[PDB]
Design a protein around this ligand. Sequence first.
Ligand SMILES: [Ca+2]
Length: 240
Amino acid sequence: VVGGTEAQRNSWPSQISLQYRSGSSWAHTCGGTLIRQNWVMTAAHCVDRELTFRVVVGEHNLNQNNGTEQYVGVQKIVVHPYWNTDDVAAGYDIALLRLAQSVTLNSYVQLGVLPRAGTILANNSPCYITGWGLTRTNGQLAQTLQQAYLPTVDYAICSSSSYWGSTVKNSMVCAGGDGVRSGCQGDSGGPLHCLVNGQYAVHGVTSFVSRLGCNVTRKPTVFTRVSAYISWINNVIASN
Ligand SMILES: [Ca+2]
């Protein structure tokens, strides 16, 4: 997250760190949202590579013991069937991970609340992106979980020529674009949390930013629109 501030430890208890085994250790690669005790919602693109993956819940600082972490292997990966790695702009950038064990819920580990199907936010709706992604374009991952205030940019604006044009689809949510604050590499798969009727809900799964850079004016961060996938999510969980 570029232009973020450090999240308080218990602000976003559904945020998870998706990690892969790298030698004797593990490397953070993507965010995710805990949606059942044994299911995580992430981006399809985060799991294109044939890697060994684990999920960390109750994580705050990637580089030190928080005393709150639980570590769980990924048992099964279900990518949306229409996802195409050669075409992120087509959408469908969403995947569900079934965990090998059910995690224990507490102040640091909670299920993310999802919006009702079909919900579209009015332009400029207040949201926060969270993640351990790069803190600058071509920079380094954060150590501590970061948050950035990123108001939505509706489909009509976001898909206009000076923004993202045809690249953005109605199955996506755009947020930010101020040239200062944005998602960045390593935030992919994580939540966009938006405040509606007094409650934060996870309206987005972080999907992409501009090839030109993370915080680029009029290139808001783009998210898979969770409310477009409610039936698909339920169908997968019910059949697995
Ligand atoms: Ca830690």
